[PDB]
Paper text:
Here, we elucidated the molecular mechanism underlying the function and regulation of [name] [name], a transmembrane receptor essential for biofilm formation in this strain. As c-di-[name] levels change [name] switches between two states: the dinucleotide-unbound off state that retards stable biofilm formation by facilitating the secretion of the cell surface adhesin LapA, and the c-di-[name]-bound on state that supports cell adhesion by preventing the release of LapA from the outer membrane. Binding of c-di-[name] to the [name] EAL domain is relayed to the periplasmic output domain through an inside-out signaling mechanism that utilizes a juxtamembrane HAMP domain, a relay module often found in bacterial transmembrane receptors. Here, we present three crystal structures of [name] from [name] that provide models for the c-di-[name]-unbound cytoplasmic domain lacking only the HAMP domain, a c-di-[name]-bound EAL domain dimer, and the periplasmic domain.
In order to shed light on how changes in the cytosolic domain are sensed in the periplasm, we determined the structure of the entire output domain (residues 22–151). Crystals grown with selenomethionine-derivatized protein diffracted X-rays to a maximum resolution of 1.8 Å. The structure was solved by single-wavelength anomalous dispersion phasing. The final model consists of two molecules per asymmetric unit spanning residues 23–150. The periplasmic output domain of [name] forms an extensively interwoven, domain-swapped dimer sharing 3,429 Å2 interfacial surface area between the protomers (1/3 of [name]'s output domain molecular surface). The dimer adopts an overall V-shaped conformation. Each arm of the fold consists of two α-helices and two β-strands contributed by one of the two protomers, complemented by two β-strands flanked by helical segments from the other. The two half sites are linked via a long connecting segment that crosses over at the center of the dimer. The other striking feature is a strictly conserved loop connecting the strands β3 and β4 formed by the conserved GWxQ motif (residues 124–127 of [name]). W125 forms the most distal point of the periplasmic domain located at the center of the loop, and its side chain is in an outward-facing rotamer conformation.
Residue numbers in the entry:
A (entry chain D): 23 to 150
B (entry chain F): 24 to 150
């Protein structure tokens, strides 16, 4: 725990940085065939940002050096009270998929996404 | 509290599609590996560990019983601000270029929110 703190911290630092880099790389790719359609650019950026996973996303025009589109959330941690979760009562919204073995369905994969960012956003809205 | 109704359905839609995307990718990934229990477990953990999930479960349809399962941290975090300061993460950022042929047109800049990472460090600190 304390013995492994420095290495563990570095792992999370590297993980979060990779998370941000992967999103930028994916978004740049998504924007490439649409860079001259302002509406689509905004749509594609909103798509990614609306998860709540990112403190900020900005697209900068290199010729003019101006912001084309940007989005910002609060970068600090939001401590949402337990009682607000019950009050809001968010449904799990799980997803699933089948794995086949030959022609027979062999297993079902069930996934449930963590609501922490969604709850944080709902709480911020509640406070406003 | 009906004013947040539209916000709620939107976030639920996002959580659903995020989970569905992952279930579909994972099912695909498991397909060539379904008879190798160790590989199934490895692949499930790999996705679970690099994403923001409450749970991932694989059920054997022949027996209707759980094969492998991963469960996550609680819905909200009570990570104290004093612990956040002790860890003292700097912003986690990445950027990429959009080009038009050999011409560079735009730069995309992203900063990832650290709340999930900190929540995980905290749960670990609590042992």
């Amino acid at each position: 725990f304390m013995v492994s703190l420095e290495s563990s911290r570095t792992q999370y630092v590297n993980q979060l940085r990779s998370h941000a880099q992967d999103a930028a790389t994916a978004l740049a790719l998504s924007l490439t065939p649409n860079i001259d359609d302002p509406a689509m650019v905004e749509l594609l950026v909103s798509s990614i940002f609306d998860s709540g996973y990112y403190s900020s996303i900005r697209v900068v025009d290199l010729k003019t050096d101006q912001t084309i589109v940007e989005r910002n959330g609060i970068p600090a941690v939001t401590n949402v009270p337990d009682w607000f979760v019950k009050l809001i009562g968010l449904e799990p919204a799980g997803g699933d998929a089948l794995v086949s073995r030959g022609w027979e369905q062999a297993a079902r994969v069930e996934v449930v996404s963590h609501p922490m960012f969604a709850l944080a956003k709902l709480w911020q809205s509640a406070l406003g």
